[PDB]
Amino acid sequence: AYTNSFTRGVYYPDKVFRSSVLHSTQDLFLPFFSNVTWFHAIHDNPVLPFNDGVYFASTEKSNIIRGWIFGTTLDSKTQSLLIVNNATNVVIKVCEFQFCNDPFLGVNCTFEYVSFKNLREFVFKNIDGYFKIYSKHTPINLVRDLPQGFSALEPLVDLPIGINITRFQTLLALHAAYYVGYLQPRTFLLKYNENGTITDAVD
Amino acid sequence: SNFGAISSVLNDILSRLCPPEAEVQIDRLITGRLQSLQTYVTQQLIRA
Amino acid sequence: CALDPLSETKCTLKSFTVEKGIYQTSNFRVQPTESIVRFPNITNLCPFGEVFNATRFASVYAWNRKRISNCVADYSVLYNSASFSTFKCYGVCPTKLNDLCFTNVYADSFVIRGDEVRQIAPGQTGKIADYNYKLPDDFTGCVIAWNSNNLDSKGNYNYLYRKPFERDIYFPLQSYGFQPTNVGYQPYRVVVLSFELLHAPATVCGPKKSTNLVKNKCVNFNFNGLTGTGVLTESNKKFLPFQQFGRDIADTTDAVRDPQTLEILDITPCSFGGVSVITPGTNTSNQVAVLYQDVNCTEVPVAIHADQL
Amino acid sequence: NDLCFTNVYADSFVIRGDEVRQIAPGQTGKIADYNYKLPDDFTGCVIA
Amino acid sequence: FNKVTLADAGFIKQYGDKFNGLTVLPPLLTDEMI
Amino acid sequence: ILPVSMTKTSVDCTMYICGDSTECSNLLLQYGSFCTQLNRALTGIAVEQ
């Protein structure tokens, strides 16, 4: 199943304050008015391709979506990124994990770290050996679909982790819905207001 | 704009390099910025 | 030319006579200036010795890559090692490494034959360069190498050889005849340092001592290796917590965050070329009047820095 | 042989062979800092 | 006077008081003198 | 309707090209009277308005 993502998936392209200005930038963005795959966590978490990068968003009221996995084989042959949110802290690791044959959260290593009603939005991209996470949160009023309205995602964390990623999978709490859209290299025009905030864009 | 320099921010060239190459990298900016100013003044003389 | 506004005018016009008029003068004023340095207050010392004093470097078909972060990078103590037979830098000049600062640094480490050293450069080609250690042509970093015959000869066929920064291993794999009697047939150790200059907060910063942070004077400042000459001032700019710098419509830097305490400072140039001198002819009077363009009269002494003029 | 200078100066000294690299205008190091530094715009020849 | 407008950075941000040496000079005759 | 003037501009050619770097300012002097003849041309345009 699919839905058309309107102007969601804009994010701050660099860690620079710009204000009262229009800026042209080329980066991996989610294309405007583009079909994103729609999934239900009630009664499903396949292994997707990662392509050049993933816009991900969960529509939620329950916190059944609790993490993500990124790698190539997902079977201890090679390093894989694991991210978990347990609603007390966020855990991030890149070990050669032996995950489950069907990964879920119960109701060798290098990098290791610890810190519907709602839409939680994320962007994952992997460039020059850095895995970059952006995010945003808002209330919403429709169960089926992403909101027809603009917002810009901002940096959550940057991981210097060097993985040659090709595949992806979300993690679900087991004994809610989510959307996946692949980024593409796009020139965007970004509008920054007086409060330094991106408030409109053109693909 | 870079005009072929390692950075368009002149202070990057001054902080990262030393005169044997920095004067060439800055000369790409001086050449390009000066040619960009001459282009503006020429079109303003014709518009005037 | 720095005496008075009529002298600044005579020098602007390259003339001793000045005809009656209003002349927009070039800044010949002294603007004495002082330097300011403001790297992060970080206390770890960078682990470069765990590269340069390692018992064995890797074989060049399968080179090791150390990451350096969150530390003071004394490059000068490394550069003071007598051993370094060659020491090159690209996009940085080595004199400035002492005075410069980065977000991460990677050190690649391996051994090659002394004949092969010339292949380790930006845009090189050859039987090592294209096949198992390629540099970017847009590199920014340093290459350091020295003969290690006293360490790595025996021959010592435990040492082996075979895109930018690609690692790849049927194989073309071969072994080195490193013997103490070998001139270019000696083993050479090599380290390649690669610098992350992206606009995130800096974490790998030179031995340079930080100063007090002078506001409201013309200063030759340096925050995290971002130098300039300007007046540093408090400002109302609503930086988001991840933003480290701010830019004008020109995409020139206009504001910064101090790494030592998270206040936002605007940057303004010192020069003020916005002066015009009203003069009768010099064949009438040496008297003049000065127009400070667009400025409020209560701000003139600050705007031209008249206390240091 | 076609040039005709006002004066010429021969600076003369001994160093270790690995340090001959340091006797160049753009370089630094324990020779090219603590005991013999060339001008960054040097006009001259280095013979070793 | 109301029908001519600005939305254009190099003027409107200077009028809103840019510091890269570019400046706007006032006309000799003010709009009241015209 | 007829145009009569256009906005008078002054570009401080040294502060545009070199941004209060003394190092660049000294290099810009090696280009000679390019910078003064730009200021002269924009001043002639400004007085024309």
XYZ file of C-alpha atoms in Angstrom:
691
model
C 0.000 0.000 0.000
C 1.071 3.644 -0.657
C 0.177 7.277 0.058
C 1.355 10.552 -1.541
C 3.725 12.516 0.784
C 3.044 16.244 0.173
C 5.937 18.492 1.401
C 7.058 16.362 4.417
C 10.759 15.359 4.651
C 12.345 18.862 4.540
C 15.266 19.159 7.014
C 18.007 21.677 7.966
C 20.761 20.815 5.408
C 23.693 22.326 7.412
C 24.370 23.428 11.048
C 24.279 27.155 10.086
C 21.812 29.854 11.189
C 20.297 31.669 8.172
C 17.361 34.095 8.545
C 15.016 36.245 6.396
C 16.525 34.624 3.243
C 15.937 32.101 0.416
C 18.697 29.475 -0.025
C 19.252 26.989 -2.880
C 20.774 23.694 -1.637
C 21.443 20.270 -3.209
C 21.061 17.286 -0.859
C 19.342 13.906 -0.446
C 15.698 14.994 0.188
C 12.361 13.157 -0.045
C 10.819 14.297 -3.406
C 7.636 16.389 -3.073
C 4.214 14.878 -3.904
C 5.824 11.367 -3.939
C 4.403 7.926 -3.105
C 5.636 6.575 0.279
C 4.981 2.973 1.374
C 2.424 2.621 4.229
C 2.740 -0.124 6.914
C 0.739 -1.207 10.005
C 2.683 -2.359 13.112
C -0.497 -4.139 14.380
C -1.227 -7.737 13.162
C 4.517 -5.859 10.313
C 8.266 -5.003 9.972
C 9.921 -6.417 6.773
C 13.552 -5.813 5.722
C 13.521 -2.876 3.246
C 16.331 -1.621 1.001
C 17.967 1.572 2.393
C 18.786 3.012 -1.095
C 20.528 6.453 -0.703
C 18.603 7.145 2.574
C 15.196 6.872 4.308
C 12.558 9.306 5.427
C 10.577 7.399 8.096
C 7.534 8.495 10.101
C 5.342 6.727 12.699
C 1.703 7.668 13.372
C 1.231 6.727 16.978
C -0.462 6.842 20.433
C 1.027 3.644 21.968
C 4.840 3.513 21.354
C 4.762 0.082 19.598
C 7.402 1.414 17.144
C 10.503 1.383 19.463
C 13.646 1.189 17.263
C 15.445 0.465 13.972
C 18.171 -1.731 12.402
C 20.433 -0.803 9.435
C 23.133 -2.889 7.655
C 23.455 -5.324 4.700
C 23.036 -8.990 5.867
C 21.604 -8.438 9.438
C 23.076 -11.840 10.563
C 26.480 -11.230 12.338
C 28.559 -11.552 9.058
C 29.215 -7.743 9.291
C 28.531 -4.607 11.437
C 24.921 -3.403 11.807
C 23.502 -0.258 13.418
C 20.890 -0.894 16.147
C 18.805 1.967 17.643
C 16.367 1.495 20.576
C 14.099 3.899 22.503
C 12.787 2.334 25.777
C 10.859 5.510 26.907
C 13.529 6.166 29.653
C 16.647 6.609 27.419
C 17.888 6.032 23.812
C 20.473 3.258 23.133
C 22.621 3.155 19.930
C 25.168 0.422 18.904
C 26.969 -0.877 15.721
C 28.174 -4.404 16.657
C 28.240 -7.531 14.421
C 24.924 -8.518 16.112
C 23.140 -11.845 15.636
C 19.558 -10.451 15.555
C 16.392 -12.614 15.662
C 15.059 -14.252 12.446
C 12.043 -11.910 13.098
C 13.327 -8.905 15.200
C 11.216 -7.339 17.998
C 11.521 -5.775 21.501
C 10.001 -7.719 24.454
C 6.877 -6.152 26.087
C 32.520 -7.763 17.801
C 31.782 -4.022 18.431
C 33.075 -0.460 17.803
C 30.591 2.413 18.528
C 28.246 2.075 21.560
C 26.129 4.869 23.155
C 23.276 5.682 25.587
C 21.642 9.122 26.207
C -3.807 8.437 15.237
C -2.965 11.357 17.616
C 0.801 11.886 16.991
C 3.225 11.993 14.048
C 6.913 11.296 14.828
C 9.181 11.985 11.821
C 12.792 10.909 11.186
C 15.352 11.058 8.350
C 18.252 8.598 8.148
C 21.146 9.163 5.678
C 24.697 7.765 5.477
C 27.407 9.975 3.863
C 31.274 9.990 4.013
C 31.120 7.415 6.886
C 28.668 9.539 8.989
C 25.122 8.303 9.721
C 22.931 11.395 10.296
C 19.562 11.359 12.090
C 17.073 14.255 11.833
C 13.584 14.387 13.461
C 10.312 16.292 14.221
C 7.124 15.748 16.346
C 3.500 17.040 15.930
C -0.135 16.184 16.793
C -2.301 15.095 13.757
C -6.040 14.493 12.929
C -6.128 11.598 10.310
C -5.456 7.809 10.791
C -4.909 6.852 7.079
C -2.391 9.422 5.950
C 0.489 11.915 6.352
C -0.624 15.552 7.024
C -1.161 18.023 4.165
C 1.101 20.760 5.616
C 4.751 21.906 5.831
C 7.344 21.228 8.594
C 11.190 20.964 8.780
C 13.102 18.169 10.606
C 16.138 19.109 12.763
C 19.267 17.126 13.871
C 18.724 14.398 16.521
C 22.258 12.825 16.411
C 25.265 12.245 14.089
C 27.095 8.851 14.305
C 30.687 8.581 12.788
C 30.139 4.844 12.209
C 31.407 4.023 8.648
C 28.885 1.189 7.781
C 28.346 0.291 4.062
C 24.490 0.209 4.544
C 22.117 -1.343 1.908
C 19.133 -2.632 4.063
C 16.823 -1.426 6.861
C 14.138 -2.694 9.343
C 12.014 -1.039 12.111
C 11.624 -2.674 15.584
C 8.222 -3.320 17.182
C 7.199 -4.061 20.800
C 5.806 -7.670 20.986
C 5.173 -10.462 23.566
C 0.119 2.001 15.273
C 1.356 2.608 11.688
C 4.433 3.952 9.827
C 5.570 5.266 6.420
C 8.820 4.744 4.428
C 10.054 7.079 1.647
C 13.491 6.887 -0.027
C 15.497 10.128 -0.405
C 16.858 11.336 -3.796
C 19.577 13.937 -4.630
C 17.420 17.074 -5.218
C 18.063 20.784 -5.524
C 15.638 22.512 -3.115
C 14.963 26.218 -2.529
C 14.515 26.749 1.263
C 12.775 29.790 2.883
C 14.227 30.866 6.260
C 12.140 33.298 8.375
C 13.314 35.959 10.924
C 13.444 33.287 13.702
C 16.039 31.386 11.538
C 13.395 28.709 10.799
C 12.712 26.910 7.487
C 8.992 27.649 6.749
C 8.586 26.884 3.014
C 10.449 25.022 0.243
C 10.455 24.191 -3.509
C 11.542 20.817 -4.968
C 31.335 31.853 -5.190
C 34.728 30.066 -5.206
C 36.027 31.210 -8.650
C 38.225 28.050 -8.420
C 39.619 28.799 -4.906
C 39.624 26.100 -2.123
C 36.906 28.145 -0.295
C 34.746 31.202 -1.057
C 35.266 32.386 2.573
C 38.536 34.377 2.421
C 39.301 33.683 6.132
C 39.446 29.900 5.389
C 42.253 30.535 2.866
C 44.102 32.784 5.371
C 43.653 30.376 8.347
C 44.410 27.090 6.450
C 47.191 28.073 3.991
C 50.508 30.012 3.961
C 51.708 32.674 1.419
C 53.370 30.406 -1.272
C 49.879 28.975 -2.135
C 47.553 31.314 -0.138
C 48.440 34.318 -2.355
C 47.375 32.241 -5.450
C 44.148 30.972 -3.809
C 43.310 34.534 -2.637
C 44.210 35.837 -6.121
C 41.442 33.549 -7.550
C 38.978 35.265 -5.166
C 40.381 38.782 -5.903
C 40.233 38.094 -9.675
C 36.687 36.676 -9.504
C 35.248 39.272 -7.058
C 36.880 42.151 -8.988
C 35.513 40.782 -12.318
C 32.104 40.447 -10.576
C 32.319 44.103 -9.451
C 33.399 45.259 -12.973
C 30.368 43.384 -14.396
C 28.011 45.210 -11.990
C 29.545 48.666 -12.689
C 29.441 48.044 -16.472
C 25.745 47.059 -16.422
C 24.951 50.008 -14.067
C 26.746 52.409 -16.488
C 24.599 51.068 -19.379
C 21.428 51.190 -17.184
C 22.308 54.756 -16.080
C 47.173 59.705 4.939
C 46.151 58.768 8.524
C 46.650 62.335 9.882
C 43.213 63.924 9.278
C 40.212 63.727 6.847
C 41.752 66.164 4.338
C 44.926 63.997 4.244
C 42.790 60.859 3.768
C 41.114 62.759 0.856
C 44.430 63.859 -0.741
C 45.574 60.208 -0.616
C 42.192 58.903 -1.949
C 42.544 61.281 -4.947
C 46.374 60.756 -5.310
C 46.615 64.592 -5.348
C 47.981 67.443 -3.168
C 45.420 69.961 -4.508
C 41.745 69.105 -3.848
C 39.017 70.884 -5.857
C 35.825 72.036 -4.027
C 33.304 69.189 -3.471
C 32.327 66.138 -1.380
C 34.748 63.176 -1.651
C 33.976 59.635 -0.465
C 37.326 58.713 1.132
C 39.200 55.389 1.199
C 39.952 54.181 4.769
C 43.636 55.081 5.499
C 43.005 55.079 9.313
C 45.215 53.029 11.681
C 42.704 50.548 13.356
C 45.474 49.145 15.672
C 43.775 45.728 16.420
C 44.580 42.822 18.837
C 44.203 38.995 18.499
C 41.630 36.767 20.325
C 41.620 32.908 20.383
C 38.666 30.752 21.468
C 39.014 26.980 20.921
C 36.937 24.579 23.154
C 38.110 24.126 26.805
C 38.832 20.388 26.115
C 41.381 18.472 28.281
C 42.117 15.048 26.662
C 45.374 14.913 24.587
C 44.977 13.296 21.149
C 46.181 9.621 20.808
C 48.539 10.190 17.792
C 51.313 8.288 19.686
C 49.115 5.129 19.365
C 49.766 5.536 15.596
C 53.359 6.897 15.322
C 54.807 4.637 18.125
C 52.782 1.465 17.256
C 54.973 -1.726 17.292
C 53.799 -2.700 13.752
C 51.894 -0.655 11.175
C 49.536 -2.633 8.864
C 50.346 -4.001 5.375
C 49.320 -1.505 2.607
C 46.735 -3.897 1.020
C 44.738 -3.733 4.326
C 45.762 -0.463 6.083
C 44.474 0.500 9.577
C 42.361 3.674 10.205
C 42.421 5.375 13.652
C 39.750 8.020 14.503
C 40.878 11.061 16.544
C 38.182 13.195 18.291
C 37.374 15.174 21.482
C 41.015 16.124 22.304
C 43.853 18.721 22.009
C 45.920 17.924 18.900
C 49.571 18.851 19.462
C 50.775 18.347 15.850
C 53.978 20.243 16.783
C 55.346 17.437 19.069
C 54.749 14.962 16.177
C 56.367 17.379 13.642
C 59.387 17.659 16.035
C 60.184 13.895 15.514
C 63.610 13.693 13.764
C 62.567 10.499 11.873
C 60.225 12.095 9.247
C 62.087 11.887 5.876
C 58.979 13.344 4.129
C 56.099 15.499 5.458
C 53.512 16.937 2.981
C 50.169 18.693 3.516
C 47.380 19.599 1.059
C 44.532 22.140 1.614
C 46.387 23.008 4.896
C 49.976 24.351 5.200
C 51.832 22.572 8.078
C 52.864 25.842 9.852
C 49.118 26.529 10.501
C 48.252 23.091 12.081
C 49.404 24.518 15.463
C 46.812 27.353 15.055
C 43.929 25.309 13.485
C 40.992 23.108 14.611
C 38.748 20.315 13.158
C 35.577 18.272 13.944
C 37.152 14.783 13.521
C 40.494 13.519 12.151
C 41.271 10.104 10.620
C 44.804 8.654 10.567
C 45.506 5.856 8.046
C 48.646 3.769 8.904
C 50.729 1.300 6.811
C 54.200 0.288 5.400
C 55.467 0.535 1.770
C 58.897 0.325 0.016
C 60.937 3.598 -0.198
C 60.537 3.554 -4.029
C 56.711 3.739 -3.618
C 56.481 6.832 -1.288
C 55.936 9.251 -4.230
C 52.609 7.471 -5.069
C 50.922 8.675 -1.807
C 49.664 12.112 -2.963
C 46.382 13.748 -4.208
C 45.762 12.823 -7.874
C 48.664 10.285 -8.131
C 48.519 7.098 -10.285
C 50.441 3.766 -10.185
C 50.694 0.170 -8.844
C 49.925 1.272 -5.211
C 47.962 4.518 -5.795
C 45.145 3.196 -8.056
C 44.954 -0.325 -6.542
C 45.160 -0.188 -2.694
C 45.861 3.362 -1.371
C 44.126 6.173 -3.343
C 43.887 9.767 -2.057
C 41.062 12.136 -3.144
C 42.101 14.824 -5.668
C 40.119 17.263 -3.388
C 41.940 15.992 -0.227
C 42.611 18.075 2.917
C 45.181 16.471 5.147
C 48.862 15.470 5.489
C 51.113 12.547 4.388
C 54.112 11.723 6.627
C 56.666 8.965 5.831
C 60.137 7.725 6.887
C 62.492 4.776 6.333
C 61.904 2.082 9.000
C 64.714 -0.360 7.985
C 65.856 -0.601 11.653
C 62.273 -1.658 12.671
C 60.665 -3.506 9.747
C 63.483 -5.388 7.886
C 64.644 -8.985 8.753
C 63.467 -10.465 4.301
C 60.395 -9.470 6.366
C 57.837 -11.079 3.964
C 55.218 -10.696 6.771
C 54.738 -7.208 5.205
C 52.496 -7.331 2.094
C 51.112 -5.205 -0.795
C 48.341 -5.754 -3.420
C 38.507 4.782 -5.463
C 39.625 7.366 -2.806
C 39.925 5.645 0.639
C 38.720 2.261 -0.837
C 39.895 -0.967 0.943
C 39.943 -4.185 -1.163
C 41.886 -7.494 -0.879
C 41.957 -15.012 -6.367
C 43.867 -11.932 -5.051
C 46.800 -9.796 -6.499
C 48.473 -10.179 -3.032
C 52.331 -9.976 -2.805
C 55.104 -9.811 -0.109
C 58.043 -7.420 0.587
C 61.769 -8.379 0.564
C 62.633 -5.974 3.449
C 66.275 -6.806 4.379
C 68.678 -4.570 6.423
C 71.214 -4.540 3.498
C 68.665 -2.996 1.016
C 68.692 2.645 -1.039
C 64.952 2.937 -1.920
C 64.364 -0.843 -1.326
C 64.084 -0.138 2.465
C 60.690 -0.330 4.250
C 59.069 3.061 4.881
C 56.382 3.667 7.504
C 53.681 6.119 6.408
C 50.769 7.875 8.131
C 48.033 9.795 6.292
C 46.036 12.372 8.288
C 42.599 13.411 6.913
C 40.735 16.422 8.402
C 36.922 16.897 8.820
C 36.303 20.659 8.213
C 32.445 20.316 8.082
C 30.519 22.990 10.092
C 29.635 20.846 13.156
C 31.233 21.725 16.580
C 35.039 21.253 16.527
C 36.675 18.478 18.638
C 40.320 18.112 17.356
C 42.026 21.454 18.013
C 45.672 22.620 18.021
C 47.907 23.356 21.079
C 47.028 27.134 20.844
C 46.054 28.738 24.201
C 42.561 30.311 24.488
C 42.195 33.989 25.616
C 39.591 36.110 27.374
C 36.753 37.042 24.930
C 36.946 40.792 24.092
C 33.556 42.306 23.082
C 33.077 45.789 21.524
C 36.652 46.320 20.098
C 38.266 45.623 16.706
C 39.871 42.154 17.118
C 41.636 39.596 14.935
C 39.480 36.769 16.381
C 39.634 32.943 16.056
C 36.757 30.641 17.200
C 37.326 26.898 16.473
C 39.785 27.877 13.618
C 37.235 30.313 12.051
C 39.415 33.457 12.017
C 38.470 37.002 11.053
C 39.041 40.704 11.741
C 36.008 42.449 13.242
C 34.101 43.764 16.266
C 32.415 41.046 18.364
C 29.007 41.988 19.839
C 26.124 40.310 21.722
C 23.017 39.754 19.510
C 19.351 38.637 19.575
C 19.796 35.863 16.889
C 17.622 32.813 17.790
C 20.147 30.033 16.996
C 18.635 26.531 17.258
C 20.681 24.349 19.727
C 22.553 22.456 16.934
C 23.595 25.641 14.989
C 27.266 26.664 15.510
C 27.626 29.708 13.140
C 25.337 32.177 11.285
C 25.618 33.836 7.812
C 24.610 37.064 6.015
C 22.756 37.120 2.600
C 26.234 36.945 0.928
C 26.728 33.549 2.708
C 29.660 35.300 4.549
C 29.871 34.538 8.320
C 27.909 37.044 10.437
C 27.599 35.364 13.871
C 29.266 32.632 15.993
C 28.701 30.654 19.200
C 31.550 30.711 21.760
C 32.609 27.035 22.381
C 33.562 27.792 26.046
C 30.159 29.303 27.030
C 27.192 29.034 24.609
C 26.571 32.804 23.978
C 25.948 34.074 20.415
C 28.169 36.894 19.086
C 27.579 38.896 15.918
C 30.642 39.840 13.821
C 30.943 43.344 12.212
C 33.916 44.697 10.113
C 36.166 47.369 11.752
C 36.943 49.426 8.602
C 33.933 51.781 8.065
C 34.642 53.102 4.524
C 31.303 55.068 4.726
C 33.093 58.461 5.143
C 32.776 61.508 2.888
C 34.798 64.725 3.301
C 33.110 68.035 2.422
C 35.810 70.498 1.323
C 36.104 73.940 -0.242
C 39.130 73.946 -2.590
C 42.638 73.694 -1.036
C 43.164 76.947 -3.042
C 40.608 78.423 -0.525
C 40.899 76.548 2.821
C 42.467 73.535 4.614
C 39.216 73.332 6.686
C 36.844 70.352 6.078
C 33.650 68.759 7.375
C 33.090 64.967 7.599
C 29.886 63.061 6.777
C 29.685 59.633 8.444
C 27.179 57.971 6.123
C 23.929 56.596 7.647
C 25.295 56.674 11.293
C 23.634 58.361 14.297
C 25.775 61.241 15.708
C 25.923 59.690 19.234
C 27.517 56.536 17.678
C 30.260 58.232 15.517
C 33.131 57.774 18.079
C 32.313 54.028 18.288
C 31.626 53.602 14.531
C 35.067 55.036 13.516
C 36.873 53.862 16.733
C 37.916 57.491 17.443
C 39.531 56.635 20.853
C 42.298 54.691 18.967
C 42.612 57.240 16.101
C 75.300 34.777 -15.457
C 73.057 37.522 -17.047
C 72.074 38.905 -13.583
C 74.139 41.568 -11.775
C 73.239 42.038 -8.078
C 74.197 44.711 -5.496
C 75.477 42.099 -2.950
C 75.168 38.286 -2.495
C 75.180 36.380 0.830
C 76.276 32.770 1.305
C 74.676 31.320 4.444
C 76.746 28.151 5.217
C 76.164 25.293 7.713
C 75.859 21.486 8.396
C 72.625 19.502 9.057
C 71.404 15.851 9.114
C 70.310 14.566 5.638
C 66.580 14.067 6.513
C 66.513 17.814 7.438
C 67.571 19.091 3.919
C 63.792 18.979 3.205
C 63.274 21.699 5.873
C 65.562 24.249 4.078
C 62.722 25.523 1.831
C 60.644 28.786 2.172
C 57.232 27.195 2.977
C 58.583 24.577 5.473
C 58.870 24.397 9.286
C 60.479 21.892 11.722
C 63.255 21.767 14.375
C 65.737 23.173 11.796
C 63.237 25.475 10.000
C 62.055 27.102 13.287
C 64.693 26.959 16.078
C 67.916 27.634 14.040
C 67.552 28.375 10.254
C 64.357 29.862 8.700
C 64.234 31.250 5.133
C 61.969 34.210 4.183
C 58.591 33.029 2.784
C 59.302 35.204 -0.356
C 63.029 34.175 -0.561
C 64.953 34.935 -3.803
C 68.070 32.820 -3.917
C 69.346 29.238 -4.286
C 69.689 26.360 -1.762
C 72.649 24.069 -2.574
C 73.243 20.949 -0.423
C 3.885 56.584 -4.020
C 1.998 53.532 -2.615
C 1.967 51.659 -6.015
C 5.815 51.199 -6.148
C 7.056 48.495 -3.748
C 10.095 46.524 -2.536
C 10.570 42.779 -1.833
C 14.246 42.638 -2.896
C 17.115 41.971 -0.460
C 20.005 44.329 -1.454
C 17.689 47.372 -1.151
C 14.941 46.346 1.310
C 17.352 44.992 3.994
C 19.494 48.173 3.702
C 16.294 50.328 3.911
C 15.206 48.120 6.894
C 17.997 49.726 9.015
C 24.314 44.159 3.999
C 27.746 45.173 5.382
C 29.880 43.798 2.449
C 30.699 47.363 1.234
C 27.409 47.828 -0.722
C 25.434 50.941 0.380
C 22.554 53.128 -0.879
C 23.070 56.912 -0.928
C 20.049 59.249 -0.427
C 18.846 61.459 -3.332
C 19.793 65.166 -3.074
C 16.123 66.257 -3.333
C 13.855 64.586 -0.727
C 10.399 63.367 -1.861
C 8.992 66.474 -0.097
C 11.235 68.726 -2.255
C 10.061 66.908 -5.416
C 4.764 57.327 -16.439
C 8.524 57.930 -16.983
C 11.630 56.780 -15.037
C 13.890 59.697 -13.973
C 16.404 58.237 -11.513
C 17.517 54.928 -10.044
C 18.728 54.111 -6.514
C 22.179 55.735 -6.011
C 24.684 53.037 -4.907
C 28.188 53.195 -3.486
C 30.279 50.015 -3.321
C 33.322 50.221 -1.051
C 35.412 48.163 -3.507
C 38.084 47.184 -0.907
C 35.484 46.007 1.664
C 33.539 44.122 -1.050
C 36.619 42.324 -2.496
C 38.654 41.852 0.729
C 36.231 42.080 3.718
C 38.663 43.911 6.107
C 41.516 41.374 5.595
C 44.816 43.341 5.538
C 46.430 40.419 3.641
C 43.903 40.612 0.789
C 43.985 44.458 0.924
C 47.771 44.367 0.261
C 47.227 41.911 -2.663
C 44.408 44.118 -4.079
C 46.878 47.077 -4.285
C 48.820 45.000 -6.898
C 45.782 45.447 -9.235
C 46.353 49.248 -9.048
C 43.671 51.788 -10.020
C 40.943 49.213 -10.884
C 39.372 49.795 -7.467
C 39.444 53.654 -7.625
C 38.014 53.698 -11.201
C 35.053 51.501 -10.055
C 34.358 53.963 -7.181
C 34.729 56.834 -9.747
C 32.236 55.221 -12.176
C 29.621 54.497 -9.437
C 30.107 58.091 -8.128
C 29.538 59.438 -11.674
C 26.348 57.308 -11.907
C 25.262 58.546 -8.436
C 25.740 62.275 -9.286
C 23.897 61.671 -12.600
C 20.750 60.624 -10.631
